[PDB]
Design a protein that fits this description.
Strand content of chain A: 5-15%
Distance between the termini of chain A: 56 Å
Shape of chain A: globular
Keywords: oxidoreductase, nitric oxide synthase, inhibitor complex
Oligomer: homodimer
Structural class of chain A: alpha+beta
Chains A, B: nitric oxide synthase, brain
PDB class: oxidoreductase
Strand order of the largest sheet of chain A: 3-4-15-12
Bound molecules: protoporphyrin IX containing FE, the ligand CNCc1cc(OCc2ccc3ccc(N)nc3c2)ccc1Cl, 5,6,7,8-tetrahydrobiopterin, zinc ion
Assembly: dimeric
Entry title: Structure of rat neuronal nitric oxide synthase heme domain in complex with 7-((4-Chloro-3-((methylamino)methyl)phenoxy)methyl) quinolin-2-amine
Number of domains of chain A: 3
Radius of gyration of chain A: 23 Å
CATH class of the largest domain in chain A: Alpha Beta
Helix content of chain A: 25-40%
CATH topology of the largest domain in chain A: Nitric Oxide Synthase, Chain A, domain 1
Number of strands of chain A: 18
CATH superfamily of the largest domain in chain A: Nitric Oxide Synthase, Chain A, domain 1
Largest sheet of chain A: 4 strands, mixed
Amino acid sequence: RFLKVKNWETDVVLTDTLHLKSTLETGCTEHICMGSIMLPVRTKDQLFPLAKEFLDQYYSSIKRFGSKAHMDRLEEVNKEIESTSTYQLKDTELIYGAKHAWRNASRCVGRIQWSKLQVFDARDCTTAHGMFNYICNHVKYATNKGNLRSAITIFPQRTDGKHDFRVWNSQLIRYAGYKQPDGSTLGDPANVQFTEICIQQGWKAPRGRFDVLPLLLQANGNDPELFQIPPELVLEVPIRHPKFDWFKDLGLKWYGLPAVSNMLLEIGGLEFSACPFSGWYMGTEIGVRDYCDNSRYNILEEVAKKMDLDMRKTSSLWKDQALVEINIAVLYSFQSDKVTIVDHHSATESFIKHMENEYRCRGGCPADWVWIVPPMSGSITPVFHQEMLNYRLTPSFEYQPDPWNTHVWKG
Amino acid sequence: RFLKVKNWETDVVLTDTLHLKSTLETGCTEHICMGSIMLPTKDQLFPLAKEFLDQYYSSIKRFGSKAHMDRLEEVNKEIESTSTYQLKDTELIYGAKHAWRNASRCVGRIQWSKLQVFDARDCTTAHGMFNYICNHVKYATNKGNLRSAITIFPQRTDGKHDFRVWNSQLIRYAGYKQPDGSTLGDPANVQFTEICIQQGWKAPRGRFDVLPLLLQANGNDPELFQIPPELVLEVPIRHPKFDWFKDLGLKWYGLPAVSNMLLEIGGLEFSACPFSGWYMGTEIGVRDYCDNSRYNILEEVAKKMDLDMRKTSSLWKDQALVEINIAVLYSFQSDKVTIVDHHSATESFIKHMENEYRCRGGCPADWVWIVPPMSGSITPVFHQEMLNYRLTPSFEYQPDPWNTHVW
Ligand code: HEM
Ligand code: HEM
Ligand SMILES: CNCc1cc(OCc2ccc3ccc(N)nc3c2)ccc1Cl
Ligand SMILES: CNCc1cc(OCc2ccc3ccc(N)nc3c2)ccc1Cl
Ligand SMILES: C[C@H](O)[C@H](O)[C@H]1CNc2nc(N)[nH]c(=O)c2N1
Ligand SMILES: C[C@H](O)[C@H](O)[C@H]1CNc2nc(N)[nH]c(=O)c2N1
Ligand SMILES: [Zn+2]
């Protein structure tokens, strides 16, 4: 079964045959589409087919399908599964799996970069302190004095699910939030709950509007521990605007390294509950979401005020005006400090090229339109007019519940 | 199976039960989501009719009543006898208001019940059609105080006699292929502007020439008609801050009146059913002016603003885009023509969602189409989870008439 997708600005039409390799479900049925829903212990019984399928994929990519190298690996993994109830990935296999999870991420606009991914094998890690060491190295390498490099660090896979390695933070670097008695929030509203945990776990909080949270790390299913990232490793950028000299006086900064640390990496049926990975920011992540979402730093009002905007009727589009300026500032500040960042036009254009290339070379490129289209100026980026097919391939990055909701406390 | 939707900006949760009444299909499966794809007999007809009449008599609190059963019987008889049937005016009105209500891509549905239905089922000719349309245009325009309306021409019979309005909107600007290679007027209407010329229209070859009407009655060849200019309200576009704006020579028409869709009620197919409301600002400003495949005025506007167009990261496309959309809203408001901004409209739609969840048990919505084409995440709909499914009565798409019409 072939499937065509069309781009209504260029009339370019592409055919998908890759969706036939799709395993997991979408949340959708013939009678309901849930494409806008945000969030729609494993036995040997189901493990080996996942192993085989994965290993068949792997040996195809290295062009050794059916070889003795292929077959003996299957034989090896097989035996290890019924003997030990799990199995270990070779280094080559781990690397492949990670890159491909990235490549399979249907919600990711940055996947043109997927082949260049520095994989750090942290599978020999046994403790929280060990975790801290690995993570510090990750940051230092990834940051690279502002010239950011994609990377992922991979901690021990899940076994019986009672011995999970988890990074409790949603991103390695992120600013504290503090609900005040009066109801106002200080710092980042997104991280209030996590800050409370951290504070409870012993963290002494500076209580400023921009405090870098401590790492909260759990190894082998033990109670998580706190660690301060050395400040010298945390690259931040003061936000200024090129024309408005009062912008700097708003006192905004942001960190340079987006490093997501709460997702689950699945490869050949193996689950990696701690797999922090990092790239570089698209400006609208900071400029549109981080500053301008109502449930976040919410500076729209103050920026609009300082710009003397007609804030009386929304039909003055003051909100829209202030948003654009804030995004201009974010990009200007990062480029001025030589810290890698991409604007939303550049990134969406790159993605379209990537995707075209993926259809030609791979038979498709699963993509979630709801997530790919940037949160401002949608229709003036080329992805808005791009039809996209959404489906799920393994290896994949998956959501997993907040560890504080599931963890069994020792003492 | 009793689905929940969450707004991630306000933590509001609504439970959807209304989807379980869904009749048509989505294009999606458990293996593939197609939510971003633009367009995925006597025995057939009675079930369809019964479902409609069931919901109608339920809506008037007469479910299972004698009147219900009597009507169900009467229609059942007519179908057996005539291989079709006719809607009582009340059913027709109910069905139209509900097809709008069920339009999952429409951000405007808060207004759904205040729709004026003009029954044009007695119409027989294209001339008759023209008269009905003129009347619709004048009622709806209402000197700039726009009112929603739909005019419904005879339903389909045997497919050989359909009524069709060939224009996609009653009012749209012509577009012509320049020898110089580019495009003058509206590029989206080039083939139609040709077909009108190709059918005898005398194009003034301008930039904003109102297209003529191509009306087809009873499966006949379509006829040309000019809307009386005094009925076409237009708005010159000026910026409230930039005086140079006026010299770009831009205007737009006030009445958005979609005319190429098929209205389906109780299994019957109204292939000619032009309807109209009022514009959300972005429809003209973001889409009609700045889409590359349209009037694409972005570059030129930005130039007038002397923005750094050397690198994409100066966000100059974004800056201009806002100003353009400010001007559109400013012009319409100043000339007292009804228009809504995307902040106001989306806010209303969330409130309308609330209402439909409460009073009806849900509200089908297509996020890809509800979220405006600019400033997406600073509108409430962006963080609003939605469920998409298809209820009847509905507006469906239908092929362009030329591709089908037996001449
Ligand atoms: C290097 C440059 C990259 C850019 C510019 C980029 C950009 C983005 C953006 C903007 C999102 C949506 C975020 C949001 O607004 O919520 C996203 C999603 C995502 N990215 Fe990328 N990304 C990059 C690299 C990576 C890397 C290195 C990985 C992993 C190896 C990755 C994996 C993902 C995944 C799994 C999602 C889905 C988020 C979810 O499902 O919640 N990305 N990307
Ligand atoms: C009264 C004010 C109204 C507003 C502000 C409004 C707004 C909108 C907008 C912005 C769209 C997206 C269209 C696009 O971007 O091309 C849309 C689609 C739609 N509207 Fe509404 N509308 C209004 C009235 C109506 C009326 C009176 C009807 C029918 C009786 C209607 C039925 C529809 C349908 C069926 C669609 C989607 C068509 C499709 O499936 O492609 N609307 N509307
Ligand atoms: C269910 N919520 C999804 C969600 C995903 C998130 O991860 C987004 C994400 C993931 C990987 C990224 C990699 C690079 C980059 N520049 N941004 C990236 C952004 C963040 C917040 C939320 Cl709320
Ligand atoms: C650019 N949009 C494409 C498209 C629009 C369509 O109708 C848009 C439409 C329909 C009804 C409307 C009613 C009011 C209004 N302001 N806009 C309205 C816009 C139908 C099919 C397609 Cl493919
Ligand atoms: C590719 C995508 O399906 C297509 O461009 C859609 C996206 N969302 C839209 N939304 C509206 N309101 N109108 C449109 O024409 C479109 N186009
Ligand atoms: C309800 C909806 O799915 C949700 O708000 C999505 C919309 N699109 C998004 N797109 C990006 N890039 N990031 C997001 O968090 C979201 N949120
Ligand atoms: Zn779907």
